[PDB]
């Protein structure tokens, strides 16, 4: 009966936690090749307890979403990091200005995909609506931190995903 | 200014005190080669040690660059046979700011810097 | 298709987390050679939730900045540590005095740079405006702490970076 | 350009985190040879945020100091530990008495020094004003704790250092 | 100058964290041979900050004491553990009674000693006044806990030590 | 004087942290052979501080007990669980 | 001057690594003739490093002892091997029992001797106090292991030797 | 040019790894004739790496010393082995006592010499300061170990050598 | 004696607690390989900033007969060219 596990992969394989890409139209093609890691989003619907006598039964509460945090490789001329900060600069101006554009301007659409083990084929695809970068991570530069490529985290807020 | 009236590279006090500091160090290291042989090892020893010394001065910024010249191109046998040893140090000492010129230009209203200067 | 990763480094390389320097004009040239580590700053714009019916949508809040913390090698005559404390002494007098200068006096400008893998070339440069040293770290001296060079952390406050 | 690091040690070396001594006149010469470890003090000046519109700029707050904690080797006749407790006994009497002397009596001066790598030469020296021992540490004695010399921590309060 | 460390042991040696014994008259001789570990007590005098202008200076607060926690080997007939609980039973009756004796009855004196490296000689001796056992520890018995002797912690309250 | 440690075991040995059993009459004999671990209980009598002048002296508070937590092996037909 | 080596044997000879016997009273005379090999015990006193400035000086730690391992010839009726296991059976019962006697019962005394090259004379004799057999070795029996007599190792624990 | 190797022995010869003796005043003359082997000590000064940009440069750390291990021939009446153990017995008592003398008592001076190939002449001589025997080796006695003289290793701790 | 007296500048051997600045105890060194004509040098590397981190033991022994005395020495280096 051990062959029964094949029912767990009628589709042809297990999904693989590394065969993925992220597309963000605002940032061009090259961002999709520079994004190292990204959690495929959680879906949270917190329970409400309703008491009767001395027992409690649960009912569905109201949906909420956590932030979406990616990790990026940075190139030698910072073509991503300068673009992410220049995007955030529309939400609230970095530097000496006190300004920021309307929500219709700084919100953007983004898409996460996971490929089949044939690299041609997309098997799951979620759009994420209304990204903007709430926090662009520090780069912890250090003369003892030798033999790594530069990476940083970025934490987008989201409105929903589909 | 040192007291010179004729022009010379050793005009400014800082240049004078730099060449004093060098002469009074290399003029000590070289003492260890008195009554040696003028063989290949003596030459390489004196080239390596004084280069190691001047590389310290180059890093701390006393001289922009230096060369140490000491081999058969000047220690020819016509020098050897009279109990003599020779070396040449080519040294370009640091400049300094002496004269500061500040210009203030009192331009008009209007007439903006994106037109005149163009950032 | 594996060669596609070359799009992640059109600029010629990944950025390296150790090819950096810090300049602080107040402290002369030598500080730039004594500064061991420094995080290239974070940029934080905290989200505001706006509720509608039983769902929430996010809008941009108001920008804030965390402190900037560097780490320094100390030389045998404390030419840095005495200078950093003598700078802090203008913000509020160390010792038996009860005095401190106006903000225009103790604030300073500073600059972080990252080099290309050709050591001649600067590829990114951020100014940090209005440093002052809020906390000069302890040096944890100990007879068992043999075979290390002396280092300490310092935590500057900042007004903004550009 | 790697030789440039020599600018980090014009003074002749890096400072070493173990070439130090502590002097406390109240306790005689021998304390200076029994003190194992001591942090060269922190200097803390906590920031105050001033808000304008929706941004904040920082200004210097008011200086404060943390406690100063050393670690001591103890000798077979407790010539240090009995002296430290007999000092604390002036701040508030240990045992069955309810007494303690005026602050002018139990406060003392102390000095921390760091030597050059020539053991003859002192290169940095801070006085600490108004020590007294707020907490004399436990000695965790145990029949399984074999092959160590006895050590304990002591935490002095301080008024300032210079 | 390295021989200078000999000033740290004029008395003949460093103190050793294992050459100790605990005597508790109430429990007979045998307790002193069954007590595995005991911290030689802390002495705590918490600081009070007095503010002037925008600085603070410290003054001596009022002395307090933490609990004293020992660890005991237990013998096959529980001659210690039954005695410690039968002592605690005077402070508040274990089982179905609701009773407990006057403080003069359940308080006891105890003594901690540390020996020289000649096992004949006592070099430090502290009495602890008014022990009683606030907490007699669990013994975590378990069929997988093989190859250890049974030990438990006990936490005495104390009034003072001298 | 090292033989003095024999006074720590006049009774014949140290107690061993694994030579134990638990009996619970409600559950029959077999529970006693299925119980893997059990802490021999704590006895807690929390101190009360009484202040005088600026010092404090302790007096006995009122006894309390923590819960008792065991660990069990389970058999193939869950006769314990 | 080569005759000077005679000072190395004023006593009459070098000691010989084979002129020895082991006596264990518990096992009768015959064990002494069946014991093939036995290391005359080590004496170990592990050093403690005490640091001063950036150097360390050593002081004597606390004595410990390793196990004592002998090797035995076995006779055709196992008069030794059955006795050693029947001794170990008192420390913890072999087979289906779960029992073992008090330490006073299963501990035994033993003696190692080395003879002079006159076989009459004993020149060194160490007692070993509190033997018991922690491990009785396997006998690696094998049809290819022809032309050897049967031997096994046994590893006693010890409390001290004199 | 092969005669040039004579510059390697201007002094008259190569040093020989067997023309040596060890003197330990505590043990009399005869020890010097019984000591078979002894490594002329190592001198260790462990490097510290200092990082700059992405390269590292080395600086001198702090000196340390390994133990010193000799090997001894033993005579038929154990005049050395009983003396070495009776020396170690001062560092921590062998047998049933729990005692040991002050460091000033059990530390001793020792000297290693190497002779010229004229046996009259000493050409190198190092004193070793503060020997004591941390480990006196086992003697692996065995009835099959025939045709060797008895030898054992001994491992002294040292404070420094000159 | 010369190698140890060099190391003594990096950190003093014996009872002193001292050692000179890095500019003093660092030295230059050179490795060469000759052609099979012994006159001619064909490769030459300088090594910058030697100092002796470890001067090896000499394992002297009365059974170690018929060898000349040798020891290892382990220099640290900053770079070579």
**d(CA D102, nearest CA chain E) in Å:** 9
H53: left (phi over 0), alpha (psi -120 to 50) or beta: left
Cβ separation G160–F13 shorter than 8 A: no
Residue appearing with tokens 């008024």: D159
Q: Are strands D122-136 and E43-52 parallel, antiparallel or unpaired?
A: antiparallel
Judged on CB neighbours under 10 Å (0-12, 13-18, 19+), H138 is middle
Give the single-character DSSP code of H104.
Answer: H
> D71 to chain C: which residues are within 8 Å by CB?
142
Cβ separation A141–C8 shorter than 8 A: no
Give the single-character DSSP code of B51.
Answer: H
Cα(G122)–Cα(G127) distance, integer angstroms: 14
Residue of F nearest to H97 (CA): F1
The experimental method behind these coordinates is cryo-EM
Q: Measuring CA to CA, how many Å separate F41 from each of D148, E68, E141, F38, F70?
A: 35, 21, 10, 9, 11
Cα(C91)–Cα(H78) distance, integer angstroms: 76
Cα(E150)–Cα(F78) distance, integer angstroms: 32
Cα(H87)–Cα(H110) distance, integer angstroms: 14
What is residue I8's three-state secondary structure? helix
Quick one: which of D154, D148, D162, D128 has its CA closest to D35? Answer: D154
**Tokens representing residue I43 in the block:** 């490769």
What is residue G66's three-state secondary structure? coil
- Sign of the CA dihedral G118, G120, G124, G129? positive
Quick one: which of G59, G20, G41 has its CA closest to H136? Answer: G41
Cα(A156)–Cα(A104) distance, integer angstroms: 16
Cα(E143)–Cα(E153) distance, integer angstroms: 20
Length of chain E, in residues: 162
Number of other residues whose CB lies within 10 A of the CB of residue F9: 23
Quick one: which of C10, C11, C27 has its CA closest to C114? Answer: C11
CA E88 distance to own-chain centroid: 16
Alpha helices in chain A (DSSP H): 30-34, 81-91, 103-106
> E18 to chain G: which residues are within 8 Å by CB?
62
Task: Find the discontinuities in chain E where C to next N exceeds 2.5 angstroms and give the residue preceding each.
Answer: none
Element (H, E) at B115: helix B113-116
Cα(B18)–Cα(B2) distance, integer angstroms: 13
Cα(C110)–Cα(C160) distance, integer angstroms: 11
Residue G91 has phi, psi (to 5 degrees) of -75, -40
H40 neighbors I55 (Cβ within 8 angstroms): no
Residue partners of A54: CB distance under 8 A and separation at least 6: none
**Tokens representing residue E109 in the block:** 């004196």
Ordered DSSP codes for E5-44? GGGGGTTSSB--TTSEEEE-GGGTTHHHHHEEEEEEPPEE
Q: Measuring CA to CA, how many Å separate E153 from each of B97, E69, G22?
A: 75, 7, 44
B7: left (phi over 0), alpha (psi -120 to 50) or beta: beta
Judged on CB neighbours under 10 Å (0-12, 13-18, 19+), A80 is buried
Which among C33, C78, C106 has the least Cβ separation from residue D8? C33
Quick one: which of E76, E101, E91 has its CA closest to E157? Answer: E91
Residue partners of D135: CB distance under 8 A and separation at least 6: D154, D155, E42, E43, E44, E45
> E53 to chain C: which residues are within 8 Å by CB?
98
Cβ separation G50–E14 shorter than 8 A: yes
Chains in touch with H (≥3 Cβ pairs < 8 A):
A, C, D, E, F, G, I
Q: Angle CA(C129)–CA(C132)–CA(C133) in degrees, nearest 5?
A: 140
Cα(D142)–Cα(E21) distance, integer angstroms: 10
Ordered DSSP codes for H60-94? EEEEE---EEEEEE-BTT-TTHHHHHHHHHHHS-S
CA C110 distance to own-chain centroid: 9
Encode C109-138: b = buried (16+ Cβ within 10 Å), e = exposed.
Answer: ebebbbbbeeeeeebbeeebbbbbbbbbbb
Residue partners of F74: CB distance under 8 A and separation at least 6: F34, F80, F81
B96 neighbors D43 (Cβ within 8 angstroms): no
What is residue E157's three-state secondary structure? strand
Which residues in chain B belong to E strands, given as ranges?
63-69, 88-93
Cα(A20)–Cα(H126) distance, integer angstroms: 69
- Maximum alpha-carbon separation in chain B: 81
Encode E94-128: b = buried (16+ Cβ within 10 Å), e = exposed.
Answer: beeeeebeeeeebbbebebbbbbbbeeeebbeeeb
Residue B117 has phi, psi (to 5 degrees) of -115, -40
**d(CA A150, nearest CA chain H) in Å:** 13
> G53 to chain I: which residues are within 8 Å by CB?
17
Ordered DSSP codes for chain D? -GGGGGGGGTTSSB--TTSEEEE-GGGTTHHHHHEEEEEEPPEEEEEEEEEETTEEEEEEEEEE---EEEEEE-BTT-TTHHHHHHHHHHHS-SSS------HHHH-EEEEEEEE-SBTT-EEEEEEEEEEEEEEEPPEEEETT--S---EEEEEEE-SEE-
Judged on CB neighbours under 10 Å (0-12, 13-18, 19+), G2 is exposed
Cα(C21)–Cα(H52) distance, integer angstroms: 10
Cβ separation H59–I14 shorter than 8 A: no
**d(CA D7, nearest CA chain G) in Å:** 25
Ordered DSSP codes for F25-75? GGG-SHHHHHEEEEEEPPEEEEEEEEEETTEEEEEEEEEE------EE---
Number of other residues whose CB lies within 10 A of the CB of residue I54: 17
Alpha helices in chain E (DSSP H): 30-34, 81-91, 103-106
Cα(H99)–Cα(H78) distance, integer angstroms: 25
Cα(G44)–Cα(G56) distance, integer angstroms: 21
Quick one: which of A25, A103, A37 has its CA closest to A68? Answer: A37
Number of other residues whose CB lies within 10 A of the CB of residue D110: 23
Cβ separation G18–H141 shorter than 8 A: yes
Encode G66-93: b = buried (16+ Cβ within 10 Å), e = exposed.
Answer: eebbbbbebeeeeebbebbeebbbbbee
C92 neighbors D43 (Cβ within 8 angstroms): no
Element (H, E) at A50: strand A44-52
- Maximum alpha-carbon separation in chain D: 69
Quick one: which of D5, D153, D157 has its CA closest to D74? Answer: D153
**Tokens representing residue A62 in the block:** 């109201």
Judged on CB neighbours under 10 Å (0-12, 13-18, 19+), D53 is exposed
> D55 to chain A: which residues are within 8 Å by CB?
98
Residue partners of G112: CB distance under 8 A and separation at least 6: G20, G21, G22, G23, G38, G40, G41, G125, G126, G128
**Tokens representing residue G66 in the block:** 């390793």
**Tokens representing residue D53 in the block:** 């519109």
Q: Distance from first CA to last CA of chain I, Å, rounded?
A: 29
Cα(H25)–Cα(H131) distance, integer angstroms: 11
CA F76 distance to own-chain centroid: 30
Residue of G nearest to C143 (CA): G53
Encode C5-19: b = buried (16+ Cβ within 10 Å), e = exposed.
Answer: eeebbeeebbbbbbb
Cα(H96)–Cα(H103) distance, integer angstroms: 21
E38 has which bridge partners? D141
Q: Measuring CA to CA, how many Å separate C140 from each of B91, C134, D24, E97, I79?
A: 44, 19, 19, 56, 32
Chains in touch with F (≥3 Cβ pairs < 8 A):
D, E, G, H
Judged on CB neighbours under 10 Å (0-12, 13-18, 19+), C74 is buried
Helix axes B13-29 and B40-60, enclosed angle (nearest 10)? 150
I76 neighbors I53 (Cβ within 8 angstroms): yes
Cα(A20)–Cα(A40) distance, integer angstroms: 10
E123 neighbors F22 (Cβ within 8 angstroms): no
What is residue G105's three-state secondary structure? helix
Cα(H115)–Cα(C140) distance, integer angstroms: 49
**Tokens representing residue D103 in the block:** 């602050």
């Amino acid at each position: 009966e051990l062959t029964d596990i094949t029912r767990a992969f009628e589709s042809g394989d297990f999904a693989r936690p590394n065969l993925f890409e992220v597309e963000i139209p605002y940032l061009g093609r090259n961002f999709s090749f520079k994004c190292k890691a990204a959690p495929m989003p959680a879906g949270i619907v917190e329970k409400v307890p309703v008491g009767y006598m001395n027992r409690k039964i649960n009912v569905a509460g109201d949906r909420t979403y956590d932030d979406w945090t990616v990790t990026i490789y940075n190139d030698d001329k910072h073509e991503v990091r300068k673009a992410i900060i220049a995007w955030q600069a529309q939400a609230h101006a970095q530097g000496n200005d006190i300004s920021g554009m309307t929500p219709a301007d700084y919100k953007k659409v983004a898409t996460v995909r996971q490929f089949s083990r044939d690299g041609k084929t997309i098997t799951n695809e979620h759009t994420i609506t209304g990204l903007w970068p709430t926090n662009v991570g520090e780069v912890q530069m250090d003369w003892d931190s030798n033999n790594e490529v530069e990476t940083f985290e970025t934490t987008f807020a989201i409105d929903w995903w589909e | 200014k040192t007291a010179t009236t004729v022009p010379t590279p050793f005009d400014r006090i800082n240049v004078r005190r730099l060449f004093n500091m060098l002469k009074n160090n290399i003029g000590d290291s070289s003492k260890w080669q008195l009554f040696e042989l003028n063989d290949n090892f003596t030459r390489s020893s004196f080239r390596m040690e004084t280069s190691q010394y001047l590389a310290g001065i180059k890093a701390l910024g006393g001289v922009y660059d230096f060369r140490v010249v000491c081999d058969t191109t000047n220690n020819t046998p016509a020098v050897i046979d009279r109990n003599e040893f020779v070396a040449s140090f080519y040294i370009k000492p640091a400049r300094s700011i002496n004269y500061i010129t500040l210009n203030f230009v009192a331009t008009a209203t209007g007439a903006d810097f994106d037109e005149l200067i163009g950032p």
